[model samples]
Target chain A: GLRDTRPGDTWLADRSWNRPGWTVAELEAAKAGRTISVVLPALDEEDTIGSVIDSISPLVDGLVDELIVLDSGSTDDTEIRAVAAGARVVSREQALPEVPIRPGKGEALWRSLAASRGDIVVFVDSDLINPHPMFVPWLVGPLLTGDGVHLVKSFYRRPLGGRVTELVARPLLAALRPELGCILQPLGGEYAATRELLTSVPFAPGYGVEIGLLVDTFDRLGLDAIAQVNLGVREHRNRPLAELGAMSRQVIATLLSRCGIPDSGVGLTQFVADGPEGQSYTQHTWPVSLADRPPMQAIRPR
Target chain B: GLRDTRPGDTWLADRSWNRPGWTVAELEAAKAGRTISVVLPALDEEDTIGSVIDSISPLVDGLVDELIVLDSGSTDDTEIRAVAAGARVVSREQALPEVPIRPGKGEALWRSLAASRGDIVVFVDSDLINPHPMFVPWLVGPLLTGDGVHLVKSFYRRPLGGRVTELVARPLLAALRPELGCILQPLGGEYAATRELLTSVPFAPGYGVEIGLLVDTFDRLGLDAIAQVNLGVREHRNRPLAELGAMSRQVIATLLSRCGIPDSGVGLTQFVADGPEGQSYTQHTWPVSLADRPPMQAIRPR
Candidate 1:
């Protein structure tokens, strides 16, 4: 029983959840009435944007309603390629004009939610090298079947990209918030949430976004509402340990703020200056804005 | 000086003895008469097989002499696809007829030496999600120029996949082989070697092939013979922990066998009794075939 949380247990649970039989009828049924929107939030991910857009768009077009990509000022050809692959590209800044655009994944995600027009919204990372068909179906299936699951997170055997996030950030979260401990791979970038739940929660702009979302959602919505699905294998970059430490600090700070842990005694400052030119000193700010675009109702042809 | 290896070391000395920048002119000048062969070892990897074969084959097709894929019984149309992709597919069983075919990566690698026709051989894993044109150039560059360097290995950031291997395997290996510690990502799958080095070395018939090859190569040829090139990012499966355990065990066994450590003596035997028909005992046998394949000279065109 002590080895109850073995990787096999998690793998099997994930496999069963995403098994063809479990979601087939639901996928077919949802195709008839409800629309599912799959959004990939990307920033300068020109390398993988096209493949991800292509993989999911065909599935969404055939089985669901819409596929949208919320581009966060990608200087590269990420937006063009994504659109070429049949995804409607909406700039995070354009979608939520009221909220000043901040440079973080969280801002892109929050804005994507506002721009999307699906009963169930699935958010996938743009940088995934292998964007399989099961990714969207697995995440959105729990909600489509009316399983009372408000949030579905993707967990996978990640390739050696950022060790700091896994070794440092995750263990820190486990120690501080033990209840969230049951969720394997907490810092994973992919998840699916109802449009209603997505709009309601506060989004942290930086590396703390995933952890912030989980903690806030759990606090407001409760544990039973959260579900983690296993995506088989994800290969991504491992950020250097030093960079991860900085990310860990932000994530820990966000957690502390959410838990009402007092900063009175803790000497941890919220802002830090970082840039190539040492002369330019500016506070690190996380401008996470969750703007509400009129729901699926406004987009629906009367 | 001890702190030189500390996290702060910026300009780390190139521990790799093999020189970089071996152009076609340089390689042609060096290997004037000697034939070189490139073996792309593949499993059921249809998606990436074409690009890899095309990229490497042309570079070495005439200069290197032979391009072969030592295939392990792929259920998918990988054989047909690989052939279509312009790779001569050699059955692992056919090449190493002495060795019993076992479901292991090492079997394919070991057999490759038999099928190939060259003085030098380079092995590349076919499942690389992102196989840049430089992949072949990078691996083979060192081998063509150097005489003392019998083996060259490729190292790339798995980005997400390296977390467990770094956190778990790196520390374990550092404790085991301190001198080989300088080699970053030792268990990396891609490598190039002379026929002499490969045939003489014992191959572990599993995921331990890389680790076993490294230890065996180091022990026989000394640390000087081996070299690793930084190949940016190698995208592959981030196998789950349970699967990684089996892989880890194979590597550990290889290390233990080399170090003369007794097996933990943890025997786990399972029994399946004959039901209703009669009282019968069945013996399930897995042949341990550490058989050596004849060098490529045996199969070369006169």
Candidate 2:
């Protein structure tokens, strides 16, 4: 019989709980103060990166100890834009050279850990058009409040996007891991957790990183240490339906591999090409190897 | 590793070939010279069955030879309504009493074969909202014209409503039997074939019948035996997104079972129910055996 993977009662008190709760003024004076660092992993995100850094950087001296943009080799002016908006910016190459660079959002974050000094790390997507300052307050509040919660994921009434979320992520979660039913938006980028938790778990070096982060966090840290906060509405850009399929495959492959099912060559897809002669359809396979960086604590910093 | 289940190269004429070419008068004398039987298989399809019978009944005496509606234990007025509209409606029990009865559209058609006498059998879905006499001509014209085409599949500029067709059916065909390219609409309801081909191949007793028919006909008979016609358009009641999932599962299971991968059992689904105690989701499993009836020629009539 398959087993259930439910979050503990300790985490349920704020499962749908949301923003404007935690404050810079309130957390600044706490003698048992904890430093919170928010990392924005960017890739060709110059459009909204400046705006995101602007709203989040103001509380750096107060509630946020350090706000940083971990640039994953952006060809655009992403680093300049974020720094102009008043946040510390570092490229993936500058963060840690000891680690072999794998191309992905999660790997950037693992290297990002070396680029910050905060005891708590919050990962926020830099592409939100209407991102409110409370995105940090609400996300980090669950961690700053010290209710024994080690990992905190934020939820929102996301507006008209996340095709991969609906067609792939939700269905796969609801089917394979119903215990994760309460954790809506598993592929969501906005989450805050202890540096200890992040440094202790492996980071999936692919698009599967965010999804991998959620499950690995849930598994390594007990469900009792995990919970979510409602962030109201978070809106961003959506890619073509075709593009979503490719990203979804990463999430799916990541899930299956973690469950000890290795190397499934299935879900290889291709587009159709038609000409006057006839039609040609090709099917390619996936490695789904999704390399991982060993726990940051295990690796000695270079 | 997989089989080349594509039908033969009889004709690729043109996808946009319209009603201007195949004349009813010329085909009427050539078609009347041959017995063309059209079977409308219904299970409580009372609303549109009558209209389908009327448009198609005009050719029943001449080119179409005989028209019948084999009611597969319909609780509604599917029989009486079709009977009043000039179709020789017969219940499944009345058609083949010697054979064990089953409930499915394909089973009804298997029995309908016992009830029909024609050189060519044209099977049209009874639930057509836009029933037309041209459905008979365009679908059967290739057979009547006879350029070595034994199996004729009807294609059209289908106006939407192909959710299951696009998502489940086509993807499976495109992957497993990529050679089956010319049979665009593999599960197309309005397909016509020679009686010799139909009786020689096994009848998938249940949901996979049409899919089985398409594949079997290609394997047993050469691929040179298949061609398609463009019926302008078809419109029908759209199933809700939820209901479509249920129906889609059966279609997917059928295609997989016929591919030598029997009872693979992967698409088991879940339904979430909410009560006072909270929510409990039920996971439902389905049998992989997409059962089929023996070939009609194997059944010695009582």
Candidate 3:
């Protein structure tokens, strides 16, 4: 039962969750002159995108000033469904026509920052099987209180999600940066950040986006600037081992690069049965690029 | 279909499998004066140790000169079952009396090198559900032929095993050590190595042992020194996500350390739901030590 004390233990106790009594009216009152934008970075999420937008559509003019769904080359009815559900959908390429897309969720999120205009930005994954209306307010609640909380990450009981979070992200944090170990869901898809914090730090592409942002925020804003919100339960489609493996690779590259190891793009080689009777194993490689996006403030129009 | 060229592609093609025509009689003729020792580093493997030893018992004289099960503080009937199944069992502590035993599969293996007398050594996990008799001959067949192969790793179609192999090890290898990415199962428990190679490298403690030995082998012996055999389908008892998370942590640390990063002992922190309705989360830390054992040849009696 004995273990070394981590630097984040005190912070974990004091600031693991948002300050209580954050009702809708309270957050609205606290929102005074501030404008909040909710961005959903989506890709081929036709079946679930509509419901996700519907969950937070009511907060459009009050707690949320703008609701934009950043479509990342979705070949499905994602944009159509999003618009039907009363949301402004912007194409990733349209957001930044100058730069070529890199084909990752982070690329979509990074582009969303340029497409929307709000003092505070919130990101929610569009693939949620059960989207909750209160996720937007809960994520931005701590930031609304204005206690120097630059980022509010969503933490929830994942019924069958977060294989990479527990296996890859949490363990890496525990070993290298124990101070960030207190974050319940370091790889959680839902989070809110002040425009100041969002525009300053560079964002890693693909699955590396969430963790890269979290650690970068901690390094620049200190541990006290980050907070978490319990959003009850999050349910989504679980992926096969192949997809999870790719996600894990990006997460590893992001974390190790932060640990000062070069994000060398060696790419990932996985095994599949290829020979007769499926007896002999063959290797397949997935090219992973750890090239992250530069800060939006550095490249965005004034 | 397009990707960067890796250094392991040539090695993967020429050396992926053991040279064919390795029948039992042919290998025995090729054995000549070399002796082989089969070691099973076990802990609380009571149910399956007997069956495992039974599978390899047929090769005790003709192919395998010594078969040892190095028990690492098993409170179960592991030693009893191992001996009954026709294996000469030795406790980890008894094998090396002067040195204090480290709690790991590698510790038991490091001690087994001192206990057994053989030119080549084979390691098979005792927890395997279905052990085949031909595994020993298949593993050592390439070594007996003697084409500069120091280590013969077993690649099998795991029905339910190798969560960490696919998710953690392969990705890290692909990203940082692309040359080793050709290996199908980097974290496999079954392998065979010449006594000379086994004694020359420092054995990393715990789950770090497999990857450490592997990368260390690749580092010192070159890619040509290694070979892999198709062991067919392998079945083993699967573990929970919590255990796999810890295993991934150690594997990550070991691989990163080999990537020129310091194996700093920041330890691992994991999460489990606590509090009423299990809504609030709590942190649990597991201490990780990256101290590897010195090369046996460096500290062994000549």
The numbered model that scores best in DockQ is 3
Candidate 2 CAPRI assessment class: incorrect
Task: Candidate 1: list runs displaced more than 4 Å.
Answer: A1-302, B1-19, B159-161, B265-302
Q: Model 1: what is its DockQ?
A: 0.01
- Model 2 lDDT tens row, B1-302: 01111112224434323233536777787765568889988888889888878888778666788888888888987867887898887888988898778777778878888888888889998888876677887777778775677788764444442544543454345445645644556677888988887877777755567777877767666566777655545666666544554455556556655666443344434332223222222444333235777788899431
| Sequence-dependent TM-score of model 2 | 0.63
- Tell how far residue A160 is off in model 2, in angstroms: 8.2
* Model 3: chain B TM-score relative to the native chain B: 0.92
Query: Pick by lDDT: which candidate is best?
Result: 3
Instruction: Output the lDDT of residue A184, model 2.
Output: 53
- The DockQ-based order of candidates, best leading, equals 3, 2, 1
RMSD (Å) per prediction: 17.6, 8.1, 4.2
lDDT of 1 by residue, A100-137 (tens): 66777767777776687776787788888876776777
Classify candidate 1 by CAPRI docking class.
Answer: incorrect
Q: Identify the runs in model 2 with alpha carbons over 4 angstroms from their true place.
A: A1-35, A96-119, A143-154, A158-163, A193-206, A215-226, A260-302, B1-302
Q: Against the true two-chain complex, what DockQ does each candidate achieve?
A: 0.01, 0.09, 0.44
